[PDB]
From Swiss-Prot, chain A:
Impact when changing L657S: Reduces ATPase activity
Coiled coil start-end: 115-143
Cytoplasmic side: 1-371, 410-423, 522-539, 723-747
Post-translational modification: Glycosylated.
Vacuolar topological intervals: 391-392, 454-501, 561-603, 663-683
Source organism superkingdom: Eukaryota
Result when mutating H661 to A/E/Y: Reduces ATPase activity
Family membership: Belongs to the V-ATPase 116 kDa subunit family.
Known role: Subunit of the V0 complex of vacuolar(H+)-ATPase (V-ATPase), a multisubunit enzyme composed of a peripheral complex (V1) that hydrolyzes ATP and a membrane integral complex (V0) that translocates protons. V-ATPase is responsible for acidifying and maintaining the pH of intracellular compartments. Is present only in vacuolar V-ATPase complexes; enzymes containing this subunit have a 4-fold higher ratio of proton transport to ATP hydrolysis than complexes containing the Golgi/endosomal isoform and undergo reversible dissociation of V1 and V0 in response to glucose depletion.
Protein name per its UniProtKB record: V-type proton ATPase subunit a, vacuolar isoform
GO MF term set: ATPase binding; phosphatidylinositol-3,5-bisphosphate binding; proton-transporting ATPase activity, rotational mechanism
Subunit structure: V-ATPase is a heteromultimeric enzyme composed of a peripheral catalytic V1 complex (components A to H) attached to an integral membrane V0 proton pore complex (components: a, c, c', c'', d, e, f and VOA1).
Pfam families noted in UniProt: V_ATPase_I
Curated annotation (Swiss-Prot), chain C:
Full protein stretch here: 8 to 59 of 233
Domain of life (superkingdom): Eukaryota
Name of the protein described by the UniProt record: V-type proton ATPase subunit E
Cellular location(s): Vacuole membrane
UniProt subunit comment: Homodimer. V-ATPase is a heteromultimeric enzyme composed of a peripheral catalytic V1 complex (components A to H) attached to an integral membrane V0 proton pore complex (components: a, c, c', c'', d, e, f and VOA1). Interacts with VMA5; the interaction is direct. Interacts with VMA10; the interaction is direct. Interacts with RAV1 and RAV2 components of the RAVE complex, which are essential for the stability and assembly of V-ATPase.
Note: Present with 16134 molecules/cell in log phase SD medium.
Species of origin: Saccharomyces cerevisiae (strain ATCC 204508 / S288c) (Baker's yeast)
Protein family (similarity comment): Belongs to the V-ATPase E subunit family.
Interaction with VMA5: annotated span: 1-13
GO terms for cellular component: fungal-type vacuole membrane; Golgi membrane; membrane raft; proton-transporting V-type ATPase complex; vacuolar proton-transporting V-type ATPase complex; vacuolar proton-transporting V-type ATPase, V1 domain
Function: Subunit of the V1 complex of vacuolar(H+)-ATPase (V-ATPase), a multisubunit enzyme composed of a peripheral complex (V1) that hydrolyzes ATP and a membrane integral complex (V0) that translocates protons. V-ATPase is responsible for acidifying and maintaining the pH of intracellular compartments.
Chain spans, region Interaction with VMA10: 12-31
């Protein structure tokens, strides 16, 4: 009950709904679990105030603001937010995975609106009760100096930061006549302007003049000062101390009491606030999504439309069996498919193993309705591209090691928090596995393990009895490795200048094969549409133009691979020399690849070119004619005629990266192992250990990370701009069934 | 449905409105009947007292 | 369920709403009768008391 990913697409439908108005929320609970359900928003060209549901949205907004305040008051205290395992029960795919919830949503609103002030009035007290305690305690230490002298006098206390300046300004404003003795604050206390434990001093002052008293009083406040009053007598001060000391135990205890209440209720609320958060979110979202339909008092039914998959009508009916089971009103079918003139949405399915693959399919863009998706191309080509980027055995194996560790630990990693750097990594854990399992094979034919080879097979090569190096030595071939390349190409620059020429050709050949494979899907969808009237009228040139040249070149290339030339009188023609001749000469090849081919190559070329205007005449012949379509098909003709060659050229980067990786690996090996070869058993072993460690540090870090990161995106290039150019010829809008999900700490 | 719902549901709804408004106009005629009933009770008993 | 049944969910619910409104109106007529009763009795009482 699915598609084949090659010819069968997604097929779906739309209807006009006639649901009863009373079961709107009832139906929403059910279809909101997993229904593959989306709505065509007829509620358009309307404002918020122009809608019949703006009343509840502000209530849910107020309660979620209350929840945000709950977040704030929670995190500002040490208590930890307990999160139960009910999210798994609330996140998933089942049958009745969201049990219906009664209308106690308003009860939740009520009790939240109650708790808000309940906690505000209870919490806004400590800020005062503490400062009153501090002020009384400060007064107590002030009075503790009852035996220190020398309305009628001024009392106060200042910070040590201004004691010298204050006393000096007193001495030079009262003109050098005063009694001024003081005692320091032992064990100082915090201030009140900045909440800082600032060193403090207390003073005492006395004078005769009342004018003096008022001057001192109205200058003290301008600076950082505090004022009080104390009795002149001694036992009067003792009585003052007793009376002010009596009334502070209550202050000591009240804060403890209010805390005891606070933490006590915090423990209880924590168990439920988190759950209620995502709960109430579910109701607001479901109300919103249902609200996109049209309703009037005209009819008890509700006017709604939405867009539904077509291969699950039976499942939809069975699931609505609950609609008729307990809340039954006996109007089961609300599905009746009509026809429209607009393109349907495009959508498909995804799976756990393909979290990354399927994402990149539509990241570039969605396809139009019944337009083939390149799922299998993403499964196959992109991994093989990345593999052929580089194939060091050690690097591939090491990279796969992390993949295996991640996939085996996915038992708990799937649930544990994914780190910022680990989110995408965990997303495509199953992709790197394919990356590596193809990388090891791709490198196997290269017979490279950190630029080394054990000579698995035997090929046979001719050498003299003795030979001194510095001389070119020729070895004839009697059969090479059946699999891969022989070790004989581990020698001097001759080996490299042969290997590069060998490899730069297979890249082009494979790219041509891949693009032919991609273009092969063109008529697949049109047949799926049965649109054969004139679509072939455009597929024909797009095929013949490219093939007549590229396939001819490929067959010519493979032709020389078969027939030798040393044994033949005709010398081997140049790797690429059959290009200029096709144009300047009327058929003269001058390479003598094949005699009869000379008189037929130009013939093939002239059939190929003649149908250039075969595309600009088919379109006007439809009857009618309109400028934009001729312009569009002209630009399409030119863009394809250039894109074929552009893609042809682009394929060399594959081999460029491959040889770059080979060279960097070789040079790192040369500069590491040879240095490590220092022969010494007294200090050389430790040097070898250090070199060995740094060699691993570099191999794992910089010879893998950057290379793979570049390779994957270059493969993304090579896949997208090549296939999708002529594959996703259309766009379809996404489908996203309304479903529950978790929410957590945020703004 | 659509080929028939627009008519059957209208038959339901406008029939309900028609019967409800029939009850309303019945109640207004009933108010008029109450007025004339008070009248006819004071058109007979009023003189009945003088008869006795 | 069956596509041909889509008219039954229309007509049966038409009948259901029709009978709901019919009962509502038939009891509204009883309400009209009660209003008749009270506004007859009170008016006749008030007038006949002065006649008496």
């Amino acid at each position: 009950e699915k598609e084949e990913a090659i010819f069968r697409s997604a097929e779906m439908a739309l209807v006009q709904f006639y649901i009863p108005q009373e079961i709107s929320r009832d139906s929403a609970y059910t279809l909101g679990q997993l229904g593959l359900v989306q709505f065509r928003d007829l509620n358009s060209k309307v404002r918020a105030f122009q809608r019949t549901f703006v009343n509840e949205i502000r209530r849910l907004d107020n309660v979620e603001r209350q929840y945000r305040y709950f977040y704030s008051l929670l995190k500002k205290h040490d208590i930890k937010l307990y999160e139960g395992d009910t999210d798994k029960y609330l996140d998933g795919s089942g049958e009745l995975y969201v049990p219906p919830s009664g209308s106690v949503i308003d009860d939740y609103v009520r009790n939240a609106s109650y708790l808000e002030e309940r906690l505000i009035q209870m919490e806004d007290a400590t800020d005062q009760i503490e400062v009153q305690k501090n002020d009384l305690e400060q007064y107590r230490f002030i009075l503790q100096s009852g035996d220190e002298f020398f309305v009628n006098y001024v009392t106060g206390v200042i910070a040590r930061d201004k004691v010298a300046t204050l006393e000096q300004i007193l001495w030079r404003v009262l003109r050098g006549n005063l009694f001024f003795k003081t005692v320091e604050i032992e064990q100082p206390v915090y201030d009140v302007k900045t909440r800082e434990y600032k060193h403090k001093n207390a003073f005492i002052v006395f004078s005769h003049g009342d004018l003096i008293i008022k001057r001192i009083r109205k200058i003290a406040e301008s600076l950082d000062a505090n004022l009080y009053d104390v009795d002149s007598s001694n036992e009067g001060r003792s009585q003052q101390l007793a009376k002010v000391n009596k009334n502070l135990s209550d202050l000591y205890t009240v804060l403890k009491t209010t805390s005891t209440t606070l933490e006590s209720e915090l423990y209880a609320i924590a168990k439920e606030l988190d759950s209620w958060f995502q709960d109430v979110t579910r109701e607001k979202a479901i109300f919103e999504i249902l609200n996109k339909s049209n309703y009037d008092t005209n009819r008890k039914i509700l006017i709604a439309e939405g867009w539904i998959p077509r291969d699950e009508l039976a499942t939809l009916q069975a699931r609505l069996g609950e609609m008729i089971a307990r809340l039954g009103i006996d109007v089961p079918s609300i599905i009746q498919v009509l026809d429209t003139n607009h393109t349907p949405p495009t959508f498909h399915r995804t799976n756990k193993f393909t979290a990354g693959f399927q994402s990149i399919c539509d990241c570039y863009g969605i396809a139009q309705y019944r337009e083939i998706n390149a799922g299998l191309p993403t499964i196959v080509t992109f991994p093989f591209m990345f593999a052929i980027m580089f194939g060091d055995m050690g690097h591939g194996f090491l990279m796969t090691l992390a993949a295996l560790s991640l996939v085996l630990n996915e038992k708990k990693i799937n649930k544990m928090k994914r780190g910022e750097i680990f989110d995408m990594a965990f997303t495509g854990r199953y992709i790197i596995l394919l990356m590596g399992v193809f990388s090891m094979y791709t490198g196997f034919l290269y017979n490279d393990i950190f630029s080394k080879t054990m000579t698995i097979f035997k090929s046979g090569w001719k050498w003299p009895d003795h030979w001194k190096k510095g001389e070119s030595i020729t070895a004839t071939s009697v059969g090479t490795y059946p699999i891969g390349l022989d070790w004989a190409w581990h020698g001097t620059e001759n080996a490299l200048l042969f290997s590069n020429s060998y490899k730069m050709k297979l890249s082009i050949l494979m790219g041509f094969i891949h693009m032919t494979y991609s273009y092969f899907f063109s008529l697949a969808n049109h047949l799926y549409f049965n649109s054969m009237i004139d679509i072939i009228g455009n597929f024909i040139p797009g095929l013949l133009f490219m093939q007549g040249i590229f396939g001819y070149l490929s067959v010519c290339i493979v032709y020389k691979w078969a027939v030798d030339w040393v044994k033949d009188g005709k010398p081997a023609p140049g790797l690429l020399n059959m290009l200029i001749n096709m144009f300047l000469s009327p058929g003269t090849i001058d390479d003598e690849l094949y005699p009869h081919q000379a008189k037929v190559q130009v013939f093939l070329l002239l059939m190929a070119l003649v149908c250039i205007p075969w595309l600009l005449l088919v379109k006007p012949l439809h009857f009618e004619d309109f400028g934009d379509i001729m312009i569009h098909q002209v630009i399409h003709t030119i863009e394809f005629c250039l894109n074929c060659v552009s893609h042809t050229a682009s394929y060399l980067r594959l081999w460029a990266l491959s040889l770059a990786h080979a060279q960097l690996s070789s040079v790192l090996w040369t500069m590491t192992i040879q240095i490590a070869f220092g022969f010494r058993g007294f200090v050389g072993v430790f040097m070898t250990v250090a070199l060995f460690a740094m060699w691993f540090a570099l191999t794992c870090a910089v010879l893998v990370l950057m290379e793979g990161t570049s390779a994957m995106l270059h493969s993304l290039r090579l896949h997208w701009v090549e296939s999708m150019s002529k594959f996703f010829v259309g766009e379809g809008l996404p489908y996203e069934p309304f479903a529950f999900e978790y929410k957590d700490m945020e703004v | 449905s659509q080929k028939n719902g627009i008519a059957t549901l209208l038959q339901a709804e406008k029939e309900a409105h028609e019967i409800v408004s029939k009850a309303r106009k019945y109640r207004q005629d009933k108010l008029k009947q109450a007025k004339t009933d008070a009248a006819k009770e004071i058109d007979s008993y009023k003189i009945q007292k003088d008869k006795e | 369920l069956t596509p041909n049944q889509v008219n039954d969910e229309l007509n049966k619910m038409q009948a259901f709403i029709r009978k709901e409104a019919e009962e509502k109106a038939k009891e509204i007529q009883l309400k009209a009768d009660q209003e008749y009763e009270i506004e007859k009795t009170n008016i006749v009482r008030n007038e006949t008391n002065n006649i008496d």
